[PDB]
Design a binder for this molecule. Structure first.
Ligand SMILES: CC1=C(/C=C/C(C)=C\C=C\C(C)=C\C(=O)O)C(C)(C)CCC1
Ligand SMILES: CC1=C(/C=C/C(C)=C\C=C\C(C)=C\C(=O)O)C(C)(C)CCC1
Lengths: 10, 245, 217, 11
């Protein structure tokens, strides 16, 4: 889960 | 109560992650508008892009939910993974124009039933349009649709939940907010709380046949399934009855 | 409110009905057994009787499996890792898994049985829920859907009232009992899918009643 | 259509 990981990141 | 600081907040996240049907300027297209086919590639390309965008907006709406943020990642990704297609259907169905039998996507793209199909809904189509109509009588509003959306998302049944009970009580007030709010807003029809709450049931029916379409479709498409769509609408662990290894 | 859907009068339907070799065939038998005694509990349901004929034949063929599942699930609050059939037999998850139905079987245990247990769902609440499931206005063919909807809404009516002066310290009781309904739908749908698989692979002995509910008109 | 259920219901 690359993307999702970054989406909830910032 | 002060349980409305929360209501208020959700209604804001919904509204800012999903524009209304009345504030969107609509445009149409004629490609694939005459009759059904396995899948009009142009339509599929527009549609997929929007989809991608919308999945992002749903995560945005997610993060803005009181408490959501403060929650395990694998649990969050899980809650979202489980509800995404649920929310997508609810959302698009609130962009339904009865008179014209059409749905309008965030950029105002406005497809008729057949295009809705030819674009990728395929089999899943007359089903989502049913929900679309099933919804009109409810005359829900933004805050209501925001709450409902937030109640599919914050769900404690989803398998693989580290803190279920946390996630269960996290959605406890949402259920209360939605009850109070629908009740205060429509005194003569108090049976609208359970009535709208239960839409979740036909909802999950569709999002089921949905994840199924995600693949039976990412077949007929010459290229690839956009990244995020995949990272969201996939991963489910083999179908039964399958015996153990 | 508590008046046209006399809660306690559904109970008289819950109660007026509530006293191998292979797991699947034991389940499919406790099923076909429970079918008969379903057509009863319904026929004894507050107004269900009045509704048209071809309509009751519909309302039931519509939610028979979810109705039955909700039942055996409730019946199993007690048992530890499995369900307890109407045939008296306990069916453990290990049993389910050997049959490759381990995962759905597990969804039943956690999303239904466990939930019903961890919240003390009583025999009445259960009956309403099943009432609601019974009264599904959206069922295709229904002649005058108008009516069924009336009925159902009248159930949320009592049930909430019922929940109201009976567990008063619990505000969201009502929501929480209704939120098992989608899971019931979810699971029921899957079960239904497996049964068609056990049928069009002709191996499991499906008795006749269960066989009719499994065949289109 | 379908017998047993159709019937049974009745009696
Ligand atoms: C994602 C997705 C699907 C479903 C989408 C639904 C049910 C709604 C989308 C609404 C949008 C994208 C709205 C907007 O523009 O706001 C289907 C099963 C066709 C398969 C491919 C991926
Ligand atoms: C749950 C389940 C299944 C479906 C069952 C149905 C539709 C009804 C059972 C009723 C009983 C067991 C009633 C009783 O004894 O009260 C199948 C066969 C796919 C196997 C895995 C688990």
């Amino acid at each position: 889960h690359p993307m999702l990981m970054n989406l909830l990141k910032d | 109560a002060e349980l409305d600081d929360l209501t208020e907040k959700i209604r804001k996240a919904h509204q800012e992650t999903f524009p209304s049907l009345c504030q969107l300027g609509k445009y149409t297209t004629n490609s694939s508008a005459d009759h059904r086919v396995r899948l009009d590639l142009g339509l599929w390309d527009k549609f997929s892009e929007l989809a991608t965008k919308c999945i992002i907006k749903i995560v945005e709406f997610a993060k803005r939910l009181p408490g959501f943020t403060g929650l395990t990642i694998a649990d969050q990704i899980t809650l979202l993974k489980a509800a995404c297609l649920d929310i997508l259907i609810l959302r698009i169905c609130t962009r339904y124009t009865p008179e014209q039998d059409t749905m309008t996507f965030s950029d105002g793209l406005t497809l008729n039933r057949t295009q809705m199909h030819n674009a990728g809904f395929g089999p899943l189509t007359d089903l989502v349009f049913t929900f679309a109509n099933q919804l009109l009588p409810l005359e829900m509003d933004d805050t209501e649709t925001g709450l409902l959306s937030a109640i599919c998302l914050i769900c404690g049944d989803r398998q693989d939940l580290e803190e279920p009970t946390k996630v269960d009580k996290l959605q406890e007030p949402l259920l209360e907010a939605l009850k109070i709010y629908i009740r205060k807003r429509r005194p003569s029809k108090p049976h609208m709380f359970p009535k709208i709450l239960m839409k979740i049931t036909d909802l999950r029916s569709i999002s089921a046949k949905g994840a199924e379409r995600v693949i039976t479709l990412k077949m007929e498409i010459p290229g690839s399934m956009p990244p995020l769509i995949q990272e969201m609408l996939e991963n489910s662990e083999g179908h039964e009855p399958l015996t153990p290894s | 409110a508590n008046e046209d859907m006399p809660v306690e009068k559904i109970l008289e339907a819950e109660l007026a009905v509530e006293p191998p070799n292979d797991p699947v065939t034991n389940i499919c038998q406790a099923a076909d057994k429970q079918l008969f005694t379903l057509v009863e509990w319904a026929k004894r349901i507050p107004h269900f009787s009045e509704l048209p004929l071809d309509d009751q034949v519909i309302l039931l063929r519509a939610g028979w499996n979810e109705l039955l599942i909700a039942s055996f699930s409730h019946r199993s609050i007690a048992v530890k890792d499995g369900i307890l059939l109407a045939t008296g037999l306990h069916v453990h998850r290990n049993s389910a898994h050997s049959a490759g139905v381990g995962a759905i079987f597990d969804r039943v245990l956690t999303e239904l049985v466990s939930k019903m247990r961890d919240m003390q769902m009583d025999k009445t609440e259960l009956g309403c829920l099943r009432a609601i499931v019974l009264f599904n206005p959206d069922s295709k063919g229904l002649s005058n859907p108008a009516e069924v909807e009336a009925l159902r809404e009248k159930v949320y009516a009592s049930l909430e009232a019922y929940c109201k002066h009976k567990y008063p310290e619990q505000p969201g009781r009502f929501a929480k009992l209704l939120l098992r309904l989608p899971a019931l739908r979810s699971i029921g749908l899957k079960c239904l899918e497996h049964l068609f698989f056990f049928k069009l692979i002709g191996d499991t002995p499906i008795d006749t009643f269960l066989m009719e509910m499994l065949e289109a008109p």
